[PDB]
Design a protein around this nucleic acid. Sequence first.
RNA 1: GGGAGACUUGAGUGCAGAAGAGGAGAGUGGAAUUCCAUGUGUAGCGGUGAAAUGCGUAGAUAUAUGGAGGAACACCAGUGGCGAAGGCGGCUCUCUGGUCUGUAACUGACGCUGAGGCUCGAAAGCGUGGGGAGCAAACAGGAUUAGAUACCCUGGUAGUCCACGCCGUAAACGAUGAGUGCUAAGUGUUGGAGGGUUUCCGCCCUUCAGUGCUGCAGCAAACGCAUUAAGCACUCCGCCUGGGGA
Lengths: 131, 274, 63, 85, 96
Amino acid sequence: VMTDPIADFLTRIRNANMVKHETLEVPASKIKRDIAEILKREGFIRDVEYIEDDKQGVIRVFLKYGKNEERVITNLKRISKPGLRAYVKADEVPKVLNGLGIAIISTSEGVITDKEARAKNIGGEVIAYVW
Amino acid sequence: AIKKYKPTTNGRRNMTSSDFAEITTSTPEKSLLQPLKNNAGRNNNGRITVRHQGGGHKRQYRVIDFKRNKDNVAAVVKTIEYDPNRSANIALVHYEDGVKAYILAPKGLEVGMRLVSGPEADIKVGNALPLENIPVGTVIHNIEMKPGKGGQLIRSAGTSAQVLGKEGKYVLIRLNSGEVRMILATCRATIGSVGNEQHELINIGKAGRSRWMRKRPTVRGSVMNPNDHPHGGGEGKTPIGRKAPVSPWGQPAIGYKTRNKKAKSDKLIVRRRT
Amino acid sequence: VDYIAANHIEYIDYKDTELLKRFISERGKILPRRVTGTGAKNQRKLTIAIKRARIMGLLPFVS
Amino acid sequence: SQERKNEIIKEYARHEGDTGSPEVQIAVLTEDINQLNEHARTHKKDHHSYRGLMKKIGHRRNLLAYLRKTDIQRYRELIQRLGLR
Amino acid sequence: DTKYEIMYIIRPNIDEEAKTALVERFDTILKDNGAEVIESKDWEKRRLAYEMNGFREGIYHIVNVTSPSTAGAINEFDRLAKINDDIIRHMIVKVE
RNA sequence: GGGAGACUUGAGUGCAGAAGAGGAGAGUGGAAUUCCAUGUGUAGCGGUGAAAUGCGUAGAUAUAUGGAGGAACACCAGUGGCGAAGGCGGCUCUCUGGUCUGUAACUGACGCUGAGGCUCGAAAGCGUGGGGAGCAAACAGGAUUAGAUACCCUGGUAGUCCACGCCGUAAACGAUGAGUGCUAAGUGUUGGAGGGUUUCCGCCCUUCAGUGCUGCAGCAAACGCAUUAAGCACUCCGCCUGGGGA
Ligand SMILES: [K+]
Ligand SMILES: [K+]
Ligand SMILES: [K+]
Ligand SMILES: [K+]
Ligand SMILES: [K+]
Ligand SMILES: [K+]
Ligand SMILES: [K+]
Ligand SMILES: [K+]
Ligand SMILES: [K+]
Ligand SMILES: [K+]
Ligand SMILES: [Mg+2]
Ligand SMILES: [Mg+2]
Ligand SMILES: [Mg+2]
Ligand SMILES: [Mg+2]
Ligand SMILES: [Mg+2]
Ligand SMILES: [Mg+2]
Ligand SMILES: [Mg+2]
Ligand SMILES: [Mg+2]
Ligand SMILES: [Mg+2]
């Protein structure tokens, strides 16, 4: 059974990106929408749209590829896992490739990138790394 | 089934007996009881003719109906009873005309079965038919050797014979011993096998129990004196020290056949065994 | 051609010895379904019917 | 037997037309379990069938655990009706 | 109930009247033991593909019956048919 | 994470269907082997690399008709089916488990994994009682050999079979734990489902669950795996830390 829909979402993106698939689809959840929009506004993914269905909804991700079909997303990594949760204090927020990547972090203020988290000086659960 | 006693005492150790689960009552039929005295292996001359017999518990004889020649009416099995005289259990049966009788209890017999005897009886456990009417391959017991004499063969607990075929006025039978022989087709037999199959597996356990069952001690000939037994005598333990072991009266005791060589029944015995 | 399907019969009686005879070779041996062109399901049903016929003497075991 | 199954379903239905529900499933499983226990005692050496019986027992246990967690009163009522522990 | 079909082989020698009596006996057996004989017929009289009990010929008889599976009718028929000499061989098969 | 609700996708039920050597019990059929009986019949038969032991004039082998009994189920039969695994192949009946496909009526997360436990578990082996044809450890004899406690030959007991009860191990292997999702294709085959044809048969398209083969991406020390991953991920469990001693 699926024990980590978030990790499943990241791996779906990773697999689709590896094959350079133009788009992908996932069952919709609030955390997944947050991750998708963060990637959108960070320019990793081309676009995001939402389909309303009767089960839980669907989120469709249009991947972004650069000139020469170069992959924008080098890789994604799930940091906090159900097996072992990962929490970082405000001063512990990490840097992904010295900022060239990002870390998606869930805080009391919402799901935000590591830049924003250390701007507000708040910690949280390190959901993922992206670069 | 067989119940094993816990080794509470050296005598009780390794002892086993029957649970008598099949036995439905312990009150035999007064009309069918007869008195029996313990001959203790002594004949009219008063001499011990068969050694190692005598003593033990008192018994009453139960008149068994080995003939099964009452074909008019059906017999309802009322009870399954212990019989001190034979290894197998007996069954008290009531004929619809009111005649009470005892029969051997075949394996699988149950209270309420309505047995029948005669040529037209169906082939069911406990029924009695002349051998000519019993289809080949059937398992039977309580076989009689002469018509109207009553069953003589296959009566011990758990025994059974099988019908192999017909020929002339005779019926081919395999007896419990494995011997195949012809038996007159007008002789009767009971369908099934004798119940109480477990009897063989009882472990008597102690000497006193054999004494209850009327077996007196058996003394080995090798520990008698020369005037008592051909094996008697000799200093210390001795080997047989003869051409072959012999009974107290010199009859060889291993492999020496004793069946009469001019037996009239050789003409009917097809294949021997034992 | 799956003869059973072509005739469109879903029941294979073991008394249809005429039907069964076209699936057994000389010597009474059963024919492979690759040789006979039939499908697996009808092949199994034919096998059962032929064996039942053999037992009841409608067909020969050998020769 | 479908007829026996349907009568049990109607008996324990939480409401009209309720084929699936903790009570109905548990009751149907209990009857199958009892019937299959008799088959097992008749065929001690039917190990393969016994495996299916164990799976039914486990599924019935899981349904009971869920029901007790969800509505303890319904759990008590069901065990009393079915004579369970 | 479960539909059974019983095809059994009567020995060729038997007379017509004895054969009829045999058929009635076995039909009576089924009905008494709780089965319902929907049909019984003298299917054919055929040479056997191979000798059976010393017979190269036989009279096949078909009885279509329907009984509860628990009922002992089929078992009792099989037992009595096995015993009876008139019947060479009987086959009982479920029919859907 | 807790508490009060809601939901139907996972899970299960209902309803309608499909296949099957799945299991257990009781019966039952034919070929063949061996033995037994009886004819015919005469000097060999059998066996090896070559021989011999052995069986045979007390009539063998062969051959014909029968009889007995035991074990296994030819053809079908197929990287075919079924089972969690071990494994399951004549046929019939009785009892009985699971699986698959539709459908969307029902419940509404009820699920996954699972230490310890429990159950099952080839073959051999063990206990009690049966059975015993063929095969065959041990064993006998004939060979081969320098020797041959072997390979080969002729015989042959336990065992192989049955019932019950122990045992609890196998290169028990895909030498690959279970669950879930995602990531090119091509081509067989088993069991289904829907449609477009096709008079039907049948052909084509779609689809589910198996089962093979080939082969991208990716992985790998390499060999290779590759939608039945050894790829990409998450959960739980078992297990490894130089070789020998062991
Ligand atoms: K003792
Ligand atoms: K007695
Ligand atoms: K003595
Ligand atoms: K002495
Ligand atoms: K017969
Ligand atoms: K089934
Ligand atoms: K043994
Ligand atoms: K294996
Ligand atoms: K396929
Ligand atoms: K060391
Ligand atoms: Mg004595
Ligand atoms: Mg002395
Ligand atoms: Mg003397
Ligand atoms: Mg002496
Ligand atoms: Mg001395
Ligand atoms: Mg074994
Ligand atoms: Mg040898
Ligand atoms: Mg091991
Ligand atoms: Mg596939």
